[PDB]
Design a protein around this ligand. Structure first.
Ligand SMILES: [Zn+2]
Length: 185
């Protein structure tokens, strides 16, 4: 059931065996698992490969479509609450807490000063973050370019643009929602 909510988002974005079939399979609960859904997306790609050739521009386009679809499934697995909110986008959607809570950090992308962000996952040498601010940019950040959220940021390289200020405002609203236990709807 909840599966239908998420897959609906994915198919809807897919627009932009065939897609109408997949859509109605989603709506009629025909997929027992995400893996069944992904297999139909794969079959869709393989049919394009068959029809036009493995080296065709049609294949290239279809490969990226499948890749984009699989990316959505990866993101869903990373955190279903983030995926829901990032798709439904109520007001202040990025401010609502998740469980477990995302680690918050200051992160510097190459070329930029520090911006606040949520940690999505990590490995020893780099961290996958989603930034606060209007564009909610996603990026891998080298571990040496991360600072604890509790650091005095006035000390460090930042550019206090309006976008940045808005990101800090969004960060503070998020920390408040955490303290309030204000969970989405
Ligand atoms: Zn989350």
């Amino acid at each position: 059931q909840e599966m239908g909510t998420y897959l609906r988002f994915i198919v809807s974005r897919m627009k932009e065996v065939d897609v109408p079939t997949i859509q109605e399979k989603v709506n009629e609960g025909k997929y027992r698992s995400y893996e069944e859904f992904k297999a139909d997306a794969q079959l869709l790609l393989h049919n394009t490969v068959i029809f036009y050739g493995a080296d065709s521009e049609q294949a290239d386009i279809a490969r990226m479509l499948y890749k984009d679809t699989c990316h959505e499934l990866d993101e869903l697995q990373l955190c279903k609450n983030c995926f829901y909110l990032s798709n439904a986008r109520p007001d202040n959607w990025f401010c609502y807490p998740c469980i477990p809570n995302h680690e918050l950090v200051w992160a510097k992308m190459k070329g930029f000063g520090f911006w606040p962000a949520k940690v999505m996952q990590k490995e020893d040498n780099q961290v996958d973050v989603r930034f606060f601010g209007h564009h909610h940019q996603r990026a891998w950040i080298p571990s040496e370019n991360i600072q604890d959220i509790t650091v005095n940021i006035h000390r460090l390289h930042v550019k206090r643009s309006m976008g940045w200020k808005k990101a800090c405002d969004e960060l503070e609203l998020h920390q408040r929602f955490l303290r309030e236990g204000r969970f989405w709807k």
